């Protein structure tokens, strides 16, 4: 959200008045505005982000670094060029073969002309070369391995969802990544970085006292369990010990979605690509129960509720235990003055802040007068509006922040005591939660299977999740497959043979890569990554785990056993490790239902929105469809005695509770409003039967 570019707002063009051409990508966007990352809604092209290396001209333009090349020799004078002076010149690329002395070995080189043209230049006229690859790409898009193999659509979807991950309680780093996860996380702000080089004095879970190398000492107050702007947690755990020596610019405390300094937006899971039982039908995803058992996907959600004490004509709002008509058992968790105490587990619809308002006196109905005569109860004239926790929200109560007008706190006008309650819960994973890898392969959770009924590997390891095959080739996003093969390679660990020296596929493969320990972190840069030769040849030599167990062949597949039937599958199945995410489109944040709730004020329609109980808009095309069936009575039902028949709703509720026939639908309110407005507009509207 920082580093974000927008074309809409005051001064600039609006949304709907703007045409199609400004949504597109001119070739001047290259190196400046990322042609991948944008929202895919009704804002496409209007909202992009910067490139990695972009920088703003003091004239408000977007300058761009270039390695200038002189006489064929690439220099190291980095020149910040802007768009117009880009068109003055002609620029070669990062994948240009250098002779380690600047010079190109190709006589014919790829190059970019001013109008976006690409030629094979004779290798003398080029005056600028790119500073690196991936100069075109944004930050978040440059966190996707194998980008060059994915089509731009699913890559756009994956990069757009990658800002929608939630913080887990563990935050484990990926095996496979880019070179961006460290630098982007130290620029992220939510990582406590050791400012000055020194030595550790004393740690805690809340602060680290650092001992600087000359005199002074400094604490760093950790933010633990802070509520973010969308309910997600903001824990900051320290990662160093007491005798450690740190330096300036070093990570000293991980943040929400970080591990050991670098980014961690999810977990690493053993995945297979078989279609299983129709549960993974059309991007549906199944899981293991082990993700529930080990809390592998578990986020802490923190919701802050609020209620105020306010002045009125009839008196003043009062926060107390005196809350007329009610058991004493439901007033157990609250304190002496109405608010609950820290750690009290709440359900849906309980009492949080015991608060009552004065109401005054009206006439009593004589039946109520009889009942109060019988029971010896008073009128109890004050009316109770306590802060009740809304539907489907529960969990612990962490913290209470309370403000008071009498305690000289600043408050808005007419307000006497403002109390806020931090409610928190620890949501597990659940069928319906939205998961996605880093490639646009998204989907709800189809079925959380138990741990035994699972296609499991020959060692007895079960797979964790199972994607679908059929969604892969038609979406043109095989970077997930390359990530799967590379993930199994990195999990298993390898050491190629050098007995006849370097095998021919691993020639361009640089050193300290011929071996690898199991569960070692690797990184592919974005447009300089593993090639087909390197990945396949490294997949060929993939040393066994505990016994002599080459589990996965050279092809990348393996023989699975059905946990349900017991027979082996007749064909080898692609397996491996993919790094996936949990997204903030959870079920409880979207589940919504209503029998009878709040209505409107102006119209008599039911009020809508998940903040209320809320209704569902039976829209226009719905009316078209039910006309198309011809179900006229049910259309009458939906249009009249669920929306605006004010005298009809109560009689329908009564007839249901009595178990009787549903009565005739009366005249809706919205017609009568139209009738009164047309009468108000000096038009005698006449209604006639004959």
């Amino acid at each position: 959200h920082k580093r974000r570019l927008s074309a809409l707002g005051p001064g600039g063009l609006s949304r709907e008045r703007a045409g199609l051409e400004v949504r597109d990508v001119h070739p001047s966007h290259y190196g400046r505005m990322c042609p991948i990352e944008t929202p895919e809604g009704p804002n496409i092209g209007l909202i992009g982000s910067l490139s990695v290396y972009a920088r703003v001209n003091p004239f408000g333009f977007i300058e761009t670094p270039y390695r200038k090349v002189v006489d064929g020799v690439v220099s190291d004078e980095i020149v910040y060029l802007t768009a117009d002076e880009e068109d003055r010149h002609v620029v070669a690329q990062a994948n240009s073969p250098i002779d380690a002395d600047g010079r190109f070995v190709e006589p014919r080189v790829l190059v970019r002309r001013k109008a976006g043209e690409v030629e094979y230049v004779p290798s003398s006229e080029v005056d600028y070369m790119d500073v690196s690859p991936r100069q075109m790409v944004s930050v978040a898009t440059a966190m996707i391995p194998f980008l060059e193999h994915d089509d731009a659509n699913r890559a756009l979807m994956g990069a757009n969802m990658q800002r929608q991950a939630v913080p887990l309680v563990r935050s484990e780093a990926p095996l496979v990544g880019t070179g961006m996860e460290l630098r982007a996380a130290i620029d992220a702000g939510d990582v406590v970085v050791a400012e000055e080089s020194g030595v550790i004095e004393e740690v805690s879970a809340d602060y680290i006292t650092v001992m600087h190398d000359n005199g002074t000492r400094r604490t760093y107050r950790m933010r633990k369990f802070a509520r973010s702007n969308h309910g997600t947690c903001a824990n900051q755990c320290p990662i160093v010990d007491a005798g450690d020596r740190v330096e300036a610019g070093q990570v000293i405390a991980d943040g929400p979605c970080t591990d050991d300094g670098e980014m961690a937006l999810g977990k690493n899971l053993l995945v297979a690509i078989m279609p299983w039982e129709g549960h993974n039908y059309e991007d549906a995803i199944i899981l293991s129960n082990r993700l529930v058992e080990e809390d592998v996907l578990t986020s802490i959600h923190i919701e802050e509720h609020e209620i105020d004490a306010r002045d009125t004509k009839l008196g003043a709002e009062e926060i107390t235990r005196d809350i007329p008509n009610i058991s004493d058992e439901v007033l157990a968790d609250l304190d002496e003055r109405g608010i609950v105490r820290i750690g009290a587990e709440v359900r849906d619809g309980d009492i949080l802040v015991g608060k009552v308002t004065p109401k005054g006196e009206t006439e009593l109905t004589p039946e109520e007068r009889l009942l109060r005569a019988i029971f010896g109860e008073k009128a109890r004239e004050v009316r109770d509006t306590s802060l009740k926790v809304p539907h489907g929200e529960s969990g612990k109560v962490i913290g209470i922040r309370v403000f008071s007008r009498e305690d000289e706190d600043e408050l808005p006008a007419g307000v006497n005591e403002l109390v806020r309650v931090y409610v928190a819960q620890k949501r597990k994973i659940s069928d319906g939660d939205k998961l996605a890898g880093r490639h646009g392969n998204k989907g709800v959770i189809g079925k959380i299977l138990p741990v035994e009924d699972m296609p499991f590997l020959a060692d007895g390891t079960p797979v964790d999740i199972i994607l679908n095959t059929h969604g892969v080739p038609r979406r043109m996003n095989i970077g997930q497959i390359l990530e799967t093969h590379l993930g199994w390679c990195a999990h298993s660990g390898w050491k190629v043979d050098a007995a006849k020296g370097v095998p021919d596929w691993a020639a361009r493969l640089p050193d300290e890569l011929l071996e690898a320990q199991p569960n070692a972190i690797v990184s592919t840069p974005v447009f300089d990554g593993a090639q087909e030769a390197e990945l396949q040849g490294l997949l060929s030599c993939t040393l066994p785990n505990r016994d002599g167990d080459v589990l996965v062949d050279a092809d990348g597949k393996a023989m699975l056993f059905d946990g349900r039937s017991g027979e082996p599958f007749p064909y080898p199945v692609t397996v491996g490790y993919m790094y996936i995410m949990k997204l903030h489109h959870l079920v409880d944040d979207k589940i919504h239902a209503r029998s009878t709730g709040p209505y409107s004020m102006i119209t008599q329609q039911p009020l809508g929105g998940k903040a209320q109980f809320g209704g569902q808009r039976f829209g226009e095309m719905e009316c078209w469809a039910m006309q198309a069936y011809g179900a006229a009575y049910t259309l009458q039902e939906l249009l009249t005695i669920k929306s605006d028949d004010t005298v009809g709703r109560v009689k329908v509720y009564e007839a249901i509770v009595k178990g009787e026939n549903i009565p005739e639908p009366g005249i809706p309110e919205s017609f009568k409003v139209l009738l009164k407005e047309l009468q108000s507009l000096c038009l005698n509207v006449e209604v006639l039967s004959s």
């Binding site: 980095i78 990062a94 300094g261 890569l513």
Partner: peptide, 27 residues
């Protein structure tokens, strides 16, 4: 690379870039 608290993540970088990533909140 060249950050004193960086864990040893190994790369497939064939090309050695001169320029490092800037201070991304400069904007």
């Amino acid at each position: 690379n060249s950050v004193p608290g960086a864990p040893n993540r190994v790369s497939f970088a064939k090309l050695r870039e001169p320029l490092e990533v800037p201070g991304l909140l400069d904007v």
